[PDB]
Chain length 263, copies 6
């Protein structure tokens, strides 16, 4: 049991805990409290002994356009200092949600129904397995354009999943990680090659294949294996989370991102 | 330049940035915003090219009794759904403040010296254990980390600093059973570099006496060497501290959300 | 000098210590004692100062179908309380053998080359992934790690080797859903350094052809440089592999003791 | 539920899982299967949600004189090779029991009623807290005298708990870690200063103090704190366990320890 | 302010500190003091607050054929050990360190092949652009009686994979264009003729000027500072071990024999 | 087989390779080439299969007063950087590495104080025995305008604790006998007069001969091999970073000024 959120729903079907971003008119842009909510849903799925897979699905043509810029503007009018304000508004929320993904014990699968940007794209890169709707998906990490730095564990996940040199080209120059680069790095495990106009049919088709794939598997093995796999990089992720959120503060406090967030 | 805080002052004397906890009537108990303020002062000292040493001093008979429990009660009474959930509330009230201040100490590039004028407790005691050098007023100082009694876990990097500075076995005895790290234990582990053996009734004299000795000790030294050496020494455990900070702050959340610490903070 | 094993032979030709799995009628399935024997052969090669390369070759259409399931059934039927508990039994039958052979591969100082003449499965496929260089007979080879289907977890250092050599996401897809790492995936990750594109019906010709090319490739090289370079390269991940070996072998115990794999090994 | 072992008993009193070595006539020397049994008891305590502390107590004048040398002689007469034999008899048992201690999630307390030697002394050094009966206790790691190397995680635990230089003096020259050195390094948290002739009264007195000390504590905090503390060195211990057991093999296979075990 | 070097020039254009290897007749082979000079240039660029990108460009058909073998023959000392500590150890540990710690975005304009220590430096850069599909990297340590240098112990498995690294290093085989492209080592191939490195160099600078427009450059550096921390310890450890372990090879004499022919 | 050095001798007695600093009139101050020579001696002892213990002994009232300041003044080069790479970087990275990797049990007979790089080497030994309670270690980096050397970045916090390390290093204070004994840095104080280092040296060797009786010596080495792996990576990383970061101090000139007076 958890509060309701009109932008994000969830349900459980057998061993699958399914989270659904349901705000396609706003390209599933997320406010701080929505990222927190995502973290709480992961933590709920993590405590449920019948759940073995946590599946993140979205809606419309974008997976998520990232942090809601209107909400960011709203966070500019209560705090004794700029530092205090950003510690509460940015630091807290980013460390919490990134942590929830890093430590999650269930197999985390992203159904990528369209592009993802910023912190939302970081979360995609923290998932264990990614399936794409079609070859038009991309991930964009526009930190250099926003006057920010790496977020959501991307310091670690991008070099790990895309290579160091590619990561520098994309991050330093604000270029997307496109479908081709995702496929070449084995970031996407299956492209479903469905039309962008029916995320819903894509979402259902992934779940249908997943039901077939798990048949006959000893599901506790999935979790036991993930527990060992996670240990390869868990320290690097936790270290990155702390430094990312604290090093980003000076950018917020300087003011550059607020200017740029307001074209 | 920075806002004023009636509980914590600072000044600069030569190469020393001196922070002073100045609320002895409340045993220098600190609220969330005071911890944040401390972090901001460290960051100010860290950016000042004339500063080589950041000296933390307090007042009265306690260094600091830790987090202000009245302020914690404040942060429980809501007004009225200011936060969408208990989780959101504690992310903002506890997680944010702890990760920020702990980080400010962990990364600080100036030599960080604690003048321990009495006992320290909880998160304040964690900040003491993050300092590079500690001087004690007398043999009645102790550090207490009462997490087991409060329904909490390690904070402020103590997951790393205590085993590092006191040994693993001693750390488990103290933390698991809510027992203080007393003067004798501090001295046996070289945690305290000098005991000044002054009366507890004059923190001011102790504070002045440490500053006086420091002015003498720095004479003739090449101060950029101090900082260059610290830069290398810090790299021994920087990763462990950064990893611990993130994990401590997130793992404590379930204790707050469960409610146990609020019950206990209210007896 | 070492005992003989009718399933695995070896010989030395110049700087090459050549190990040959020679039980094609049973797809070179291996029992516990055969894995141990493999470790002993590696240790023999490692002590021979004339050996610079340890080459592992097999026979027939499979490199190895993995652990021999008949032998596993053998190790279930007791005779009759030979072991005081299920735990004791599996410590001796599984834990011991896996930690030993995995360690022999992880620490091996000679250049370890796998001639992949067909598919490999399970612990045998883990040993392939521990080799420094892999050459394939043709594009029908694959590696399968069917742990999820057998009620087991990662073995033979695959916790480390698979994400390292295939990427994390691909590893989770294959391991979580019991899907093979196919030729195309091997080639895309540079796991296979050369595909010889020969028919599956002649592992012998493939084996000979790899040895022939190797004799050519080593000409003019300073062979101690190969070993010196490997010594440094190994240090990149040696700690991760040693940590994984201990954890894999101990964490698998509860799966054996629970009984699930025995059920499944028996269909 | 677990098989019975005439040399080692256990029971549960409230939040305490108490393990008792009960073979004082043989100085609580332990055979391979007894070390395995200890591991299984730890694993049982670890799975019991009412247990917060796992307390290891012994009997008589020695905590344990270490591996039973008669049993070692017995392991010399079935295996295709010396290697196979030692993999089964030594490697398996050492990795298993050392692992059980390294990963144990409950607070592990050793009641040190007398000296400990060899692998038994390694296990004492893996405990979180140690209480001594009196100032005559010592730990001896006689590997250099037996033609062996570090065991039971001592590669890590001894430098960690006693310092590097002291560890080299003791290990290289087969010298004990005596009471004074234990106290100076804070290895012993309390010396009870009771007579060596009543381990039983010592054991009971520790339990009596423990019952008093836990009053008012939030016990899940103890475990939550241990979980974080353990992470400081967990990787080093797991790495050491694997290399210790595999590097010791060549000593067994060479034969030196068997000669020496037989004066 | 720094001494001049006839083989290597530099200049600054806006946020770009541009280093230019300018000895094409000798395939930009470099002597010890030239490697040191490269390090000093990186350290100069690193201290300049207006610089955000350090761009390494070369000349002619080769990026660099590596260490100058005539200079090695050219190389007072109480022992062989002392000699090689001074001639090889010192220089390698210094220049490798300068690249490992550099805080500005390091971009290599790869105008042709690179070999040996020069190829190690290419592998330490953050971004690599190639002139055409004839570029390759060669690490001929096994043929020279040497071992890994310039952080290659770490950079090659990291950027090319472990298995591929072993095949190339153990058997003295090049990392060719195709292998570079499949591992994303090259971020863009400009597909220009090998006969005009200058035009390639100018074209990269032109595209860079376009790509930085609108970016908040301190973000580039802030991000690099975090990214660097993923492997900084491994690189520092490898540098020390590479330089010390190679000593026994030099002292044994094998490389000197082979460097002759 | 190795060159002779008038300041440092060695010999082998059974399983002991004994190195003897024999320049008491100059308090066994060591020049660069002497540090290199020490490294070469360790590497010789390490390759000798009959050696299980490498014992470092000195002469007179000091173990060693550290780097020879006359030799530093004495210290052709295209730049200050090149000079210090060759004179300081090379020598420090080499000798520190020789101690860090040494596989035999390394025992220091501390016959008096040690300073600077020599004191760093003492801190890298596995076991230390003191002549009497007047020994101390001094690391005067802050007074010389230098930083940590010889692996002290790691060895001092490891062997003395972090807080104590900061007090001593930041303020140029000695690690005295009492601090050494409280941290178990000294395994035995022989309590002999400072006027007879020779007798102390002989007495330690005598006790060592007694202590090894009955031990299986390959166990000593097998155990050390594992023990070393606890911190080997940290020491190798520190060596590289120490030697490179000190460069800017030498190049700035401060230490040379101060080394004068
Ligand atoms: C592409 C680059 O290279 C540029 C950069 O790196 S700089 C930063 C990149 N972009 C961002 O950070 C956030 C914006 N993301 C986007 O995708 C841009 O909106 C886009 C113009 C590129 C997409 O265009 P599009 O597909 O036509 O979507 P668009 O019509 O803008 O959005 C649909 C609605 O959702 C809203 N929305 C989308 N993303 C949002 C966000 N992050 N915050 C708030 N609202 C958002 C839009 O404002 C719009 O609302 P209205 O109908 O009220 O105008
Ligand atoms: C056996 C153990 O090991 C016991 C344990 O304590 S476990 C719980 C740990 N304690 C805490 O968390 C810290 C809170 N403070 C204390 O427990 C006690 O104040 C102390 C034992 C540490 C000191 O004892 P003391 O000198 O008698 O304190 P006291 O006289 O109350 O302090 C003077 C004033 O400062 C106030 N104050 C002190 N610490 C405070 C805090 N952390 N928050 C808010 N107010 C505080 C007191 O309430 C008091 O104000 P009033 O006179 O207006 O009530
Ligand atoms: C969809 C998936 O991804 C499926 C999965 O398989 S998950 C379970 C993974 N499989 C295993 O663990 C390995 C066991 N072997 C096999 O599954 C199958 O043999 C295989 C599919 C890998 C190969 O298919 P195949 O060529 O038809 O094998 P098969 O003809 O049985 O082998 C020839 C002989 O070798 C024997 N043999 C092969 N592998 C053996 C093993 N691991 N243990 C004992 N005997 C074995 C066979 O039993 C057979 O002997 P008989 O003719 O006397 O019965
Ligand atoms: C002290 C050193 O420095 C020497 C060394 O390092 S080398 C190895 C050190 N010792 C060992 O490894 C194992 C032996 N441990 C001991 O404590 C020696 O028995 C000791 C002589 C030093 C103790 O003397 P003690 O207190 O009089 O005990 P002791 O009378 O030997 O033992 C009581 C009984 O328990 C038995 N026992 C004790 N430890 C045992 C072991 N590890 N294996 C088998 N049986 C054992 C004894 O054999 C004896 O049985 P009996 O009555 O049948 O003779
Ligand atoms: C079996 C094998 O496969 C051999 C190996 O790979 S192992 C050795 C690999 N290569 C090295 O170690 C570096 C030495 N350089 C070379 O071998 C060659 O330059 C090369 C094979 C890389 C390319 O060959 P190329 O394009 O024909 O070079 P070339 O046109 O001769 O170069 C022009 C001039 O620069 C010189 N030069 C090139 N590299 C040099 C170096 N590292 N040091 C000094 N001078 C060098 C050439 O010697 C030549 O000078 P001269 O005309 O005065 O003799
Ligand atoms: C404020 C402070 O507290 C100062 C500091 O600590 S910072 C500087 C610390 N010390 C150093 O850096 C090393 C230099 N050595 C010394 O200062 C002194 O030797 C010492 C203080 C360590 C001991 O003093 P001492 O016991 O009186 O030495 P002394 O009897 O003069 O030595 C005998 C000879 O050896 C020489 N010697 C000692 N150390 C030497 C070195 N490192 N290089 C060259 N020669 C040296 C002395 O100069 C003297 O030679 P001359 O008679 O030819 O001048």
């Amino acid at each position: 049991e958890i509060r309701q959120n009109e932008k994000i729903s969830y349900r459980i079907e057998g061993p699958f805990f399914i989270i659904h971003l349901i705000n396609p008119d706003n390209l599933n842009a997320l406010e701080g409290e929505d990222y927190i909510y995502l973290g709480e849903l992961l933590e709920l799925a993590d405590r449920n002994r019948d759940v073995y897979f946590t599946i993140i699905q979205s809606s419309g043509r974008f997976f998520s356009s990232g942090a809601d810029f209107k909400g960011i503007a709203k966070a500019q009018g209560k705090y004794p200092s700029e530092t205090s304000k950003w510690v509460s508004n940015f630091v807290a929320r980013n460390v919490y949600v990134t942590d929830a993904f890093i430590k999650h014990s269930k197999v985390l699968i992203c159904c990528l129904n369209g592009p993802a940007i910023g912190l939302s794209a970081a979360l995609v890169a923290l998932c264990d397995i990614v399936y794409s709707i079609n070859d038009k998906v991309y991930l964009l990490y526009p930190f250099a354009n926003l006057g920010l730095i790496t977020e959501g564990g991307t310091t670690v996940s991008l070099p790990l999943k895309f290579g160091t040199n590619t990561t520098y080209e994309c991050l330093m120059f604000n270029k997307p990680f496109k479908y081709d680069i995702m496929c070449e790095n084995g970031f996407i495990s299956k492209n479903f090659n469905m039309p962008s106009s029916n995320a819903e049919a894509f979402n259902a088709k992934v779940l249908e294949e997943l039901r077939e794939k798990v048949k006959g598997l000893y599901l506790p093995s999935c979790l036991g294996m993930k527990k060992l796999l996670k240990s390869n990089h868990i320290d690097a992720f936790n270290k990155a989370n702390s430094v990312e959120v604290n090093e980003s503060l000076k950018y917020w406090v300087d003011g550059e991102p607020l200017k740029r967030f307001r074209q």
